[PDB]
mmCIF file of C-alpha atoms in Angstrom:
data_model
loop_
_atom_site.group_PDB
_atom_site.id
_atom_site.type_symbol
_atom_site.label_atom_id
_atom_site.label_comp_id
_atom_site.label_asym_id
_atom_site.label_seq_id
_atom_site.Cartn_x
_atom_site.Cartn_y
_atom_site.Cartn_z
ATOM 1 C CA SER A 1 0.059 -0.015 -0.126
ATOM 2 C CA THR A 2 2.963 2.357 0.772
ATOM 3 C CA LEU A 3 5.879 2.172 -1.482
ATOM 4 C CA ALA A 4 9.178 2.440 0.560
ATOM 5 C CA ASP A 5 12.682 2.102 -0.363
ATOM 6 C CA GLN A 6 16.219 2.189 1.290
ATOM 7 C CA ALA A 7 19.845 1.708 0.419
ATOM 8 C CA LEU A 8 22.245 4.121 2.530
ATOM 9 C CA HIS A 9 25.308 3.390 4.323
ATOM 10 C CA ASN A 10 28.150 1.043 2.926
ATOM 11 C CA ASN A 11 26.948 -1.229 0.427
ATOM 12 C CA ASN A 12 29.068 -1.660 -2.828
ATOM 13 C CA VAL A 13 30.613 0.739 -5.119
ATOM 14 C CA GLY A 14 30.215 0.518 -9.008
ATOM 15 C CA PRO A 15 32.404 3.321 -10.703
ATOM 16 C CA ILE A 16 32.215 3.350 -14.491
ATOM 17 C CA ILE A 17 34.846 5.067 -16.407
ATOM 18 C CA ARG A 18 36.282 4.700 -19.863
ATOM 19 C CA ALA A 19 39.466 2.887 -20.672
ATOM 20 C CA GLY A 20 42.934 4.486 -21.674
ATOM 21 C CA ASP A 21 46.080 1.961 -21.613
ATOM 22 C CA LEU A 22 47.896 0.095 -19.446
ATOM 23 C CA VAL A 23 44.974 0.494 -17.086
ATOM 24 C CA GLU A 24 44.727 -3.404 -16.563
ATOM 25 C CA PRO A 25 48.087 -3.878 -15.157
ATOM 26 C CA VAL A 26 47.666 -0.459 -13.252
ATOM 27 C CA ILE A 27 44.233 -1.046 -11.805
ATOM 28 C CA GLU A 28 45.483 -4.549 -10.561
ATOM 29 C CA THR A 29 48.753 -2.820 -9.078
ATOM 30 C CA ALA A 30 46.617 -0.112 -7.821
ATOM 31 C CA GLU A 31 44.408 -2.574 -6.058
ATOM 32 C CA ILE A 32 47.243 -4.454 -4.222
ATOM 33 C CA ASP A 33 48.370 -1.068 -2.886
ATOM 34 C CA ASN A 34 45.186 -1.209 -1.242
ATOM 35 C CA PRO A 35 43.655 -3.705 1.359
ATOM 36 C CA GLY A 36 41.332 -4.382 -1.268
ATOM 37 C CA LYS A 37 41.252 -8.308 -1.036
ATOM 38 C CA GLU A 38 37.401 -8.499 -1.757
ATOM 39 C CA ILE A 39 36.875 -6.477 -5.182
ATOM 40 C CA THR A 40 36.014 -7.475 -8.349
ATOM 41 C CA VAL A 41 37.252 -5.631 -11.730
ATOM 42 C CA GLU A 42 35.495 -5.626 -15.046
ATOM 43 C CA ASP A 43 37.684 -4.321 -17.513
ATOM 44 C CA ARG A 44 36.520 -5.025 -21.075
ATOM 45 C CA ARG A 45 38.792 -2.555 -23.168
ATOM 46 C CA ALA A 46 36.719 0.287 -24.181
ATOM 47 C CA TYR A 47 35.505 0.942 -20.642
ATOM 48 C CA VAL A 48 36.851 0.199 -17.125
ATOM 49 C CA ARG A 49 34.442 -0.799 -14.157
ATOM 50 C CA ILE A 50 35.133 -1.764 -10.804
ATOM 51 C CA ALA A 51 33.306 -3.074 -7.864
ATOM 52 C CA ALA A 52 34.001 -2.966 -4.031
ATOM 53 C CA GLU A 53 32.435 -3.400 -0.775
ATOM 54 C CA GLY A 54 31.794 0.238 -0.884
ATOM 55 C CA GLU A 55 35.018 1.839 0.622
ATOM 56 C CA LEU A 56 38.064 2.344 -1.710
ATOM 57 C CA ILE A 57 41.163 4.627 -1.140
ATOM 58 C CA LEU A 58 43.770 5.239 -3.603
ATOM 59 C CA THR A 59 47.129 7.243 -3.376
ATOM 60 C CA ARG A 60 48.877 6.451 -6.625
ATOM 61 C CA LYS A 61 48.146 9.705 -7.947
ATOM 62 C CA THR A 62 51.684 9.490 -9.490
ATOM 63 C CA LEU A 63 50.840 6.264 -11.580
ATOM 64 C CA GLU A 64 47.877 8.028 -12.743
ATOM 65 C CA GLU A 65 49.760 11.296 -13.284
ATOM 66 C CA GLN A 66 52.458 9.616 -14.865
ATOM 67 C CA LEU A 67 50.330 7.654 -17.237
ATOM 68 C CA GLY A 68 49.694 11.268 -18.642
ATOM 69 C CA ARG A 69 52.018 13.831 -16.921
ATOM 70 C CA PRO A 70 51.200 15.904 -20.123
ATOM 71 C CA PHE A 71 47.642 16.818 -18.829
ATOM 72 C CA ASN A 72 45.518 17.970 -15.982
ATOM 73 C CA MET A 73 42.796 16.775 -13.593
ATOM 74 C CA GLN A 74 40.239 18.131 -16.058
ATOM 75 C CA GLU A 75 40.889 15.350 -18.430
ATOM 76 C CA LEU A 76 39.877 13.268 -14.942
ATOM 77 C CA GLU A 77 36.535 14.559 -14.662
ATOM 78 C CA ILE A 78 36.020 14.369 -18.257
ATOM 79 C CA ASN A 79 37.513 10.812 -18.769
ATOM 80 C CA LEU A 80 34.207 9.188 -17.199
ATOM 81 C CA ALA A 81 31.097 7.372 -17.949
ATOM 82 C CA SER A 82 29.391 6.947 -14.781
ATOM 83 C CA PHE A 83 29.396 5.922 -11.186
ATOM 84 C CA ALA A 84 27.689 4.143 -8.294
ATOM 85 C CA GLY A 85 28.854 6.173 -5.703
ATOM 86 C CA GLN A 86 30.926 9.224 -4.814
ATOM 87 C CA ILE A 87 34.404 10.533 -5.516
ATOM 88 C CA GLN A 88 36.611 12.396 -3.349
ATOM 89 C CA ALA A 89 40.546 13.709 -3.878
ATOM 90 C CA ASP A 90 42.706 14.671 -1.320
ATOM 91 C CA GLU A 91 46.060 16.682 -1.296
ATOM 92 C CA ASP A 92 47.768 14.028 -3.725
ATOM 93 C CA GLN A 93 45.115 11.253 -3.696
ATOM 94 C CA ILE A 94 41.571 9.803 -4.626
ATOM 95 C CA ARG A 95 39.229 7.786 -2.720
ATOM 96 C CA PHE A 96 36.059 6.191 -3.802
ATOM 97 C CA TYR A 97 32.758 5.191 -1.737
ATOM 98 C CA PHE A 98 29.106 4.929 -2.160
ATOM 99 C CA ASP A 99 28.256 5.940 1.248
ATOM 100 C CA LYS A 100 26.211 9.152 1.380
ATOM 101 C CA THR A 101 25.785 10.954 4.461
ATOM 102 C CA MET A 102 29.030 10.815 6.421
#
């Protein structure tokens, strides 16, 4: 009779972006750098999809910056497709999470 839905708090993240190059050995290496012993990556080729518990944190801004030193942060916000959660960047790092209210 009454429609109701809910899905807040840690659940799972699903960042959808495009594919560049060497994102395979980069994503894998970027995964080992993080204690993500329970994440599933789905890199086809044209795009790059990821799936975690809902909490992720990356600091390999040097690897991402190196892959394309001759660029900026604009290309980052441009080089994307979709997302399941939110994204944040720190001094020199980028973290992902599907958590809404903090």
